[PDB]
Design a protein around this nucleic acid. Structure first.
Lengths: 1033, 130
RNA sequence: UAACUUUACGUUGUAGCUCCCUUUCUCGAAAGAGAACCGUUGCUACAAUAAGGCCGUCUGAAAAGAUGUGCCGCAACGCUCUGCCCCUUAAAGCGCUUUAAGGGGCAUCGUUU
């Protein structure tokens, strides 16, 4: 029932919001609410991988192990039913009893010998288990090892690959099987089938029974039967669908039509940029250069310039270069066309001169056949039964295509003829973000949390009249892209520091601290070659620092163009060219008739070494003022465009009815933040998100107009006048409401209750009674709850647990990691004293570096040492208090995460019961609390005497009222060996605790340990009480 | 001066290492986690990350791609001990106030209990400080 | 991109052979061996490769047996379903409980699968 505008600050891990009440003409009058919603990034915390991809890899590994076990089980069933395997010779598990552990020697000697059925089953099960690799970076290396062993058997004197395997791998070293990354031992599946059939032949020749039965077949049934691969249905389902015919799957870029379409689109989005003039390619030019991707191989931008007729200084737009535009880039190529041509050249079908006889439709069919199927067999078998076979083996020798495009085939095949010539219901609450449209985990999570915030706002207050979303420059970028951005920011900092050093060296007489304006003045003057860009005079370097002599002025007027760029500024003197006004350097320099002044102005802005983009922007004077202003005012990224369309379509907005979703740009938000007096501190707190959300929610069109008219008044003389503020004392009110402390003074105590915040607002803003309304509450950053009860069950290292009566967890440590600290905790340390001093010498010789000391092989020595054996890894005892029993109770692991931590009274003492993920899977709910020092076996036992209070999850709000002080925040972790919780302050304030967390909280004797519940808006703070203990399963 | 700050990195309450500055202490947590991940299904993916970029070996890769997300259950409790071997301050809390905070009773409650509790920590970290 | 086929590595267990090397006992005899036992280097095997949970499935009286190109299990998202916490309204009673309704929040519930 209140008109208001909502802003947002969507980030990778935080969505700060704010709602600003507006009047009948959408002019902000008050600020009625705000807050920040912090959440975990939807990425792997290390290397920023895809969580879904990692889970899929784990599931695929599980599937592989399950299939291998099932295949070996079926092999054992076959051996039990095909003739005999000495029926009932199996254990209780069904395995093989007394299986001969020499199956490589069995494959070697089975060529001429009558194998015992036990040895016959040993060799056979060996063949199924290690059944080689089939064709179906790292893969190329593995195929290299496969090919090497394949050639050895073809040209060698050994029939079976295993025969050469042992007979030469025992000469080379002591191992026959593959080790670490030595692919010299890998075999191939076709050679294994040949070995199997010749083995059956030999076992038949030597009168061995159990050979001629149904086995000889069933063995190939188990050996070569394989799960097939994907089809076009996966491409349809997991990617987009064509609007015209969703039934149609997606084309591939390795087709002629797709390459033509992308080339034509690139032509449509390419212009000619010379002397600050942007001109599209003419029809004659388009026809002239269209032949280039087929006449030659690659289309370099410099090559394109050389082929056509244009000036040398003419660069190309659309090439998003960070810096160093001197090097030319490449436009695009016919990947499929050139690949087919070079394959035909290499296979005696092309000479780089004859035209490609295959039709473009035929090329499309070939590309679709090569891309839809991931194996050679299916391609060769089907091919849609189209083309001749000779070129089929020609292509399959080298050509491999795997890619897809965004449009359906037909759709492209119908648009191309028309383009070659040159041409739901709205409701109150926002619906779920469509996972199909946003195929990015981090952005999807951010948008879902933003939708949660919007829904909470709508529920509490009503439909927003307008939405002012703007996201950080990091959303919509890969993790490597974000790392590149932060790195470039780091060196951009170093560079700023070096520039400040340069300025202080040049002008030691200058006092104070070099700000951005003067440092920009100096750097640009260095780049301007010591000359003003209005009259072309030599200006006084000494007088550069002082005010009045020089002043930064945007050549393109700010009121009509709305440009605020890093280097779109011209170092003009002042009082000598104050007649520019809002006229742009076209009529002030009189470029209408190419006056002389214009001529040398262009010459001095192009001959003198200035950035190319600056040379271009300063010299446009031929743009659409409103369109260019809206290009530099809004943002048109994929995510912002999607948000605009989705929010406009799928929720109520009681606005003016034309465009009620306004996606802003980062530069304009930063500029208006600067004008309205940001100051203070940021990036050390989590409330600057709400600050920027308030700032963007006051960037209404009326305010861009008040800014426009003020800047227009300021351009010419027209003569402390405050810059347009949304209301009086805007900065004071906003920074009291966001942070709780006045401006410039981050040392005062935060007013974190309604009473003290209201009193502070009334005492500091007595002139503005609208700062204190019914909705004035202190900001409380809300962290997204994580009540999930699943996760890694146990670290991935399995440690021997025979000696678990003590604390030791003996494990094999490779020598390339054996440190001096790992020699003390070694098993045969007194049992074999000589090797203890033999290994310790190598630690001391190379200065405690196992990688270099043990790069050469280490060896044991006899009493009179004579090079007996070699040490590669040695056992290392490690203390193991508690762990998870894994591998059918053959090894122990380490606990992964606490999925829940219950609390228990009886003694005014809160006992904490840690519940781990492996316990939830087994349905086991622990009955033991935590006590310091003593192990789990001595832990306090839980019975009916212990009152149950609640259960703790990570990022779940709690309050420990210890006697000394009260502590509030979100539970993070617990010291298992010490039993103290870790509490994160709500805003992660960097001046409280260790980087915002309160470690080592004393809960065992706290006056009251209880947990609260926080709304998605960060409001409605109240304790939550459980009645009964919740089951784990 | 005599007060020297140490760092007792412990996982699941089990003491594992002991360093001199927090930087190596947090770096060590990554190396332990990465070497643990490389023991199973994630070893295949982790091999390229050590190879596609010139950051061979886990220790060197972490040295430059250091992240504050060093997994949970890793406890980096920061104690400081003077040259006399007697513990003075823990994290940001003095030993007299530490027992008042992490053990939950002041010095005026039971002095001889400290000889059973405060002195208990001294021998507990005496075994840790090896 | 999608998902894919994989063999391969690794960790732990068992057994075979093999390195050093404990007490041990046997042989002499003082360090060298014969049996053990216990550690453990290397190699070759099989088993497991999350913790755990389901089917299909032929027998059948089922303890169980016969079987399979077998399925799910570390994620995101959601509220049709059950449950937790939470307000809102009404009804009664005895703030507290019950009943009823509505709105959320979050999973051990649901979908992608």
């Amino acid at each position: 029932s209140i008109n208001y505008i909502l802003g947002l600050d969507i980030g990778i891990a935080s969505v700060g919001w704010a709602m600003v009440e507006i009047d009948e003409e959408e002019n902000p009058i008050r600020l009625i609410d705000l807050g920040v919603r912090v959440f975990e990034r939807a990425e792997v915390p290390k290397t920023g991988d895809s969580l879904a991809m990692a889970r899929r890899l784990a599931r695929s590994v599980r599937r592989l192990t399950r299939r291998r076990a099932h295949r070996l089980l079926r092999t054992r069933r076959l051996l039990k039913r095909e003739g005999v395997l000495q029926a009932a010779n199996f254990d209780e598990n069904g395995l093989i009893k007394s299986l001969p552990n020499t199956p490589w020697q069995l494959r070697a000697a089975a060529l001429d010998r009558k194998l015992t059925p036990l040895e016959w089953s040993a060799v056979l099960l060996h063949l199924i288990k290690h059944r080689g690799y089939l064709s179906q970076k790292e893969l190329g290396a593995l195929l290299k090892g496969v090919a090497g062993n394949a050639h050895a058997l073809q040209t060698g004197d050994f029939r079976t690959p295993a025969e050469l395997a042992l007979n030469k791998f025992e000469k080379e070293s002591g191992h026959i099987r593959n080790q670490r990354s030595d692919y010299s031992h890998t075999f191939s599946r076709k050679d294994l089938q040949a070995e199997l059939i010749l083995l059956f032949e030999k076992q038949k020749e030597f009168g061995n029974p159990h050979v001629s039965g149904g086995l000889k077949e069933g063995i190939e049934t188990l050996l070569m039967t394989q799960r097939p691969a994907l089809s076009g249905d996966a491409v349809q389902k997991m990617l987009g669908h064509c609007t015209f015919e969703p039934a149609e799957p997606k084309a591939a870029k390795n087709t002629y039509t797709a390459e033509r379409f992308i080339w034509l689109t690139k032509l449509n989005n390419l212009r000619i940029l010379e002397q600050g003039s942007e001109r599209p390619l003419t029809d004659t030019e388009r026809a002239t250069l269209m032949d280039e991707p087929y006449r030659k191989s690659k289309l370099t931008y410099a090559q394109a310039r050389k082929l056509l007729g244009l000036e040398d200084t003419a660069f190309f737009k659309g090439l998003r270069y960070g810096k160093d535009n001197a090097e030319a880039s490449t436009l695009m190529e016919m990947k499929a066309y050139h690949a087919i041509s070079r394959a035909l050249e290499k296979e005696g079908l092309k000479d780089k001169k004859s035209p490609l006889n295959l039709s473009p439709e035929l090329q499309d069919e070939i590309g679709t056949a090569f891309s839809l199927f991931k194996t050679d067999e299916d391609i060769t078998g089907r091919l849609k039964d189209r083309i001749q076979p000779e070129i089929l083996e020609a292509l399959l020798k080298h050509i491999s295509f795997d890619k897809f495009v965004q449009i359906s085939l037909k759709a492209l095949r119908r648009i191309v003829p028309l383009m070659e010539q040159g041409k739901t219901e709205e409701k109150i609450y926002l619906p779920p973000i469509p996972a199909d449209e946003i195929r990015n985990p981090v952005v999807l999570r951010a948008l879902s949390q933003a939708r949660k915030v919007i829904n909470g706002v709508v529920r509490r207050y009503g439909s927003p009249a307008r939405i002012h979303i703007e996201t950080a420059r990091e959303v919509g970028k890969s993790f490597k892209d974000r790392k590149e951005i932060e790195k470039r920011q780091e060196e951009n900092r170093k560079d700023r520091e070096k520039a400040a050093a340069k300025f202080r060296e040049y002008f030691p007489n200058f006092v104070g601290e070099p700000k951005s304006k003067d440092i920009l003045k100096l750097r640009l003057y260095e780049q301007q070659h010591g000359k003003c860009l209005y009259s072309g005079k030599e200006i006084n370097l000494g007088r550069l620092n002082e005010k009045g002599y020089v002043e930064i002025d945007h050549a393109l007027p700010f009121s009509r163009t709305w440009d605020d760029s890093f280097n779109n500024k011209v170092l003009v003197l002042g009082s000598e060219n104050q007649n520019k006004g809002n006229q742009t350097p076209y009529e002030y320099f009189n470029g209408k008739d190419n006056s002389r002044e214009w001529q040398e102005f262009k010459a001095r802005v192009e001959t003198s070494r200035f950035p190319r983009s600056k040379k271009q922007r300063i010299l446009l004077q031929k743009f659409d003022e409103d369109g260019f202003k809206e290009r530099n005012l809004n943002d048109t990224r994929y995510v912002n465009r999607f948000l605009c369309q989705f929010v406009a379509d799928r929720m109520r907005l009681t606005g003016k009815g034309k465009k009620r979703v306004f996606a802003s740009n980062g530069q304009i938000t930063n500029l208006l933040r600067g004008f309205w007096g940001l100051r203070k501190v940021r990036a050390e707190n989590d409330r600057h998100h709400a600050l920027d959300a308030v700032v963007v929610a006051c960037s209404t069109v009326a305010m861009q107009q008040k800014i426009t008219r003020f800047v227009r008044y300021k351009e010419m003389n027209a003569f402390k006048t405050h810059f347009p503020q949304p209301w009086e004392f805007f900065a004071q009110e906003v920074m009291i409401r966001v942070f709780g402390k006045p401006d410039g003074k981050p040392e005062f105590e935060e007013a974190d209750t309604l009473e003290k915040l209201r009193t502070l607002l009334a005492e500091k803003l007595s002139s503005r009674p609208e700062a204190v309304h019914e909705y004035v509450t202190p900001l409380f950053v809300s962290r997204a709850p994580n009540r999930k009860m699943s996760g890694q069950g146990h670290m991935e290292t399995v440690k021997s647990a025979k000696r678990l009566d003590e604390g030791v967890s003996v494990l094999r440590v490779p020598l390339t990691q054996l440190k001096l600290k790992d020699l003390e905790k070694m098993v045969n340390r007194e049992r074999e004293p000589k090797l203890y001093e033999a290994l310790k010498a190598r630690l001391e010789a190379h200065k405690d570096d196992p990688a270099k000391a043990f790069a050469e092989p280490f060896y044991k020595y006899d009493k009179a040492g004579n090079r007996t054996q070699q040490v590669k890894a040695v056992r290392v005892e490690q203390v193991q208090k508690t762990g998870v029993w894994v591998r059918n109770h053959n090894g122990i692991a380490d606990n992964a995460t606490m999925v829940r931590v219950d609390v228990f009274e009886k003694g005014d003492k809160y006992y904490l019961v840690p519940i781990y993920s492996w316990q939830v899977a087994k349905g086991i709910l622990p009955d033991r609390a935590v006590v310091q020092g003593k192990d789990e076996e001595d832990w306090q036992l839980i019975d009916d005497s212990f009152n149950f209070k609640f259960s703790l999850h990570p990022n779940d709000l709690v309050e420990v009222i210890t006697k000394k002080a009260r502590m509030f925040g979100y539970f993070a972790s617990c010291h298992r060996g010490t039993g103290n919780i870790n509490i994160r302050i709500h805003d992660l304030d960097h001046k409280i605790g260790k980087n915002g967390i309160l470690e080592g909280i004393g809960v065992k004797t706290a006056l009251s340990f209880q947990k609260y519940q926080i709304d998605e808006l960060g409001k409605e703070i109240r304790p939550c009480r459980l009645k009964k203990r919740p089951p784990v399963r | 001066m005599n007060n020297s700050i140490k760092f007792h990195v412990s996982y699941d309450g089990t003491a594992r290492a002991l360093f001199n500055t927090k930087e190596q202490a947090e770096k060590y947590c990554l190396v332990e986690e990465i070497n643990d991940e490389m023991n199973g299904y994630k070893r295949k993916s982790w091999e390229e990350k050590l190879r596609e970029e010139n950051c061979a070996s886990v220790q060197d890769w972490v040295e430059k791609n250091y992240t504050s997300s060093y997994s949970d259950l890793f406890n980096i409790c920061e104690i400081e001990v003077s040259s006399a071997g007697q513990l003075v301050k823990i994290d940001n809390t003095e030993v007299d106030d530490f027992v008042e905070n992490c053990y939950g009773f002041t010095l005026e409650d039971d002095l001889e209990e400290f000889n059973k509790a405060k002195q208990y920590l001294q021998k507990f970290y005496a075994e840790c400080e090896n």
